[PDB]
């Protein structure tokens, strides 16, 4: 432990900002003595041998709240000469030696990404995201954060880069695959609302490659359909939904999930006279499904869950509502 | 060795630590944590744990809300008791005695023991308010929390009336009611201190049946043993 000699540099670096704040009338001298003592206690806690990511986050939160306090006080005392750049630089320094000391803590990596995104640092955010993905490649949350922020920026090629490396790594759970199909169809909806893409064959290709993965269950394909069934206002949405249903019917013929997609298929983009027409079609499918030879307890639990989802909406007729209740109660 | 006697009295009357090993030992004395952990604890960790304890105590009873402002304050994280003057120290002693009278009823509970641990580890109540702390733990003299308080008490800081506790500090066992009652019949100071503590509580209406039964039993047995001592047969001596 050379921690005193190690923290001497960080205190001597933070000193001239305190000299500027003392030569302005923004912080008084007793308050600056308090800032000196608090930063000194924080540095000698941070550079200690036995340290913790919560200790690094407490120091980050204190420095960021000091920047916010000085911003409020500077706007109140009407000064424009004092800048926040030194505080952001030292907060980046705290975070860089934080991710040096504890690279295996995703809470601290995500706090670093939240800070770098919040003070408008996109290129630095991309570099931090690359380092975090290299250290935690099995983390679907980090991969979806990278891909969704690249899609939110609009660099769809970079979003596909992050997502295809993520689906190359995370193949135990379906989560990142579902999020990639969600992002690709959101790109398809953006390409539609801007008015290949005319076919929209990429989620069908995602399904065809996902057919051979170690998570490939009927529940996983039902999760694929439950992702796909949102935002039906598209062009090839009936093509995608019909391909999912014929895939599940050709592969898992008598599963309750396949009977559930047989129930809930024809209600794609409905909200309105086309609503109860397709509801009567789907209820015919549902009655045939309930009488048919399938695990009725599993199919009934699926249908009462979907019927709670149905009952969550207003603006319907009471006869339809009470016949949903009557068909619910005997399950 | 008259000079060694004068310096021993000065060192016993001194209150603040002046070398690093003394500061580390005085910071190590705690109720809850073992000493190896309690050395390396800043006053934010202790305040977080013991303020969770005081939040539980303030949700139990209503009348802890002034101590929420004066004793368990986020500014009271930082106040050093040995750097304030005599009147600030006396007002802090009044606030501590009021809290100890208030917390004596719930002292078997871990929230109240966490609150007393905050007072001990910040304001050093085991050194500066040994009388009121030892009196408010005396009705619970059969519990391991009293054994731990007896362990962390300084020896020369105990008042003269409670110096029967020295073999129970040398061997960490809880003292029995026979020892407390026998020292009450022998010393009038211990009986006066117990009765003064419970009457000063009962004037502030912070009584509880454990304290009332404790004082009633010990004054009954002490007056019993005191009459059996006072009986003499000679007329003027019995008068």
């Amino acid at each position: 432990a050379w921690v005193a000699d190690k923290a001497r540099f960080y205190l001597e670096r933070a000193a001239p900002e305190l000299r500027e704040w003392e030569e302005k009338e923004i912080f008084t001298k007793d308050e600056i003595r308090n800032l000196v003592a608090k930063r000194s206690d924080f540095e000698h806690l941070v550079l200690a041998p036995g340290t913790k990511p919560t200790d690094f986050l407490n120091y980050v939160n204190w420095e960021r709240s000091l920047d916010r306090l000085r911003a409020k006080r500077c706007a109140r005392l009407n000064i424009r000469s004092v800048t926040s750049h030194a505080s952001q630089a030292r907060t980046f320094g705290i975070f860089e030696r934080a991710v040096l000391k504890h690279p295996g803590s995703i809470e601290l990596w995500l706090a670093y990404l939240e800070f770098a995104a919040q003070v408008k640092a996109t290129k630095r955010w991309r570099r931090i995201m690359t380092r975090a993905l290299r250290l935690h490649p099995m983390n679907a949350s980090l991969w979806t954060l990278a891909g969704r922020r690249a899609a939110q920026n609009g660099d769809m090629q970079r979003a596909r880069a992050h997502f295809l490396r993520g689906c190359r790594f995370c193949t135990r759970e379906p989560t990142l695959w579902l999020e990639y199909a969600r992002c690709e169809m959101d790109w398809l909806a953006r390409m539609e609302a801007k008015k290949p893409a005319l076919s929209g064959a990429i989620p069908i290709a995602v399904f065809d490659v996902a057919r051979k993965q170690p998570f490939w269950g009927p529940a996983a394909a039902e999760k694929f359909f439950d992702v796909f069934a949102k935002f039906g206002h598209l062009s090839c949405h009936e093509r995608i939904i019909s391909h999912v249903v014929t895939t599940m019917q050709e592969l898992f013929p008598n599963h309750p999930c396949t009977w559930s997609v047989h129930i809930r298929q024809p209600l794609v983009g409905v909200d309105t006279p086309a609503f109860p027409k397709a509801l009567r079609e789907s209820l015919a499918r549902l009655k045939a499904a309930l009488q048919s030879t399938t695990d009725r307890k599993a199919l009934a639990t699926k249908m009462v869950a979907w019927m709670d989802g149905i009952l969550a909406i207003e603006k319907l007729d009471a006869a339809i509502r009470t016949v949903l209740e009557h068909t619910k109660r005997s399950l | 060795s008259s000079l060694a006697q004068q310096l021993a009295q000065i060192a016993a009357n001194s209150r603040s630590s002046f070398n690093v090993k003394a500061l580390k030992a005085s910071h190590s004395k705690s109720l809850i944590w073992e000493p190896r952990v309690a050395v390396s604890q800043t006053f934010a960790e202790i305040y977080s744990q013991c303020y969770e304890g005081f939040k539980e105590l303030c949700h139990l009873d209503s009348r802890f809300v002034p101590f929420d402002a004066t004793l368990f304050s986020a500014q009271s994280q930082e106040v050093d008791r040995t750097q304030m003057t005599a009147e600030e120290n006396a007002a802090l002693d009044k606030r501590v005695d009021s809290f100890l009278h208030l917390v004596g009823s719930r002292l078997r509970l871990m929230p109240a023991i966490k609150a007393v641990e905050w007072l001990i580890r910040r304001f050093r109540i085991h050194e500066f308010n040994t009388g009121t702390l030892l009196a408010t733990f005396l009705p619970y003299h059969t519990i391991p929390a009293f054994v731990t308080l007896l362990s962390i008490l300084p020896v020369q800081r105990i008042p003269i009336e409670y110096r029967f506790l020295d073999p129970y500090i040398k061997s960490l066992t809880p003292p029995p009611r026979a020892a407390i009652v026998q020292q009450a019949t022998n010393r009038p100071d211990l009986l006066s201190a117990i009765s003064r503590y419970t009457l000063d509580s009962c004037r502030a209406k912070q009584e509880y049946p454990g304290l009332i039964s404790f004082w009633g039993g010990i004054m009954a047995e002490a007056v019993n043993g005191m009459i059996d001592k006072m009986r003499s047969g000679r007329r003027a001596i019995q008068l």
Partner: peptide
């Protein structure tokens, strides 16, 4: 007052509250 409540909360968190601790003591 000329101070926001969020500014006073940041002042009590960042800078310390020793003066109001002494004020809460002497009551």
């Amino acid at each position: 007052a000329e101070k926001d409540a969020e500014e006073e909360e940041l002042e009590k968190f960042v800078l310390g509250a020793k003066e109001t601790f002494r004020e809460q003591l002497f009551r």
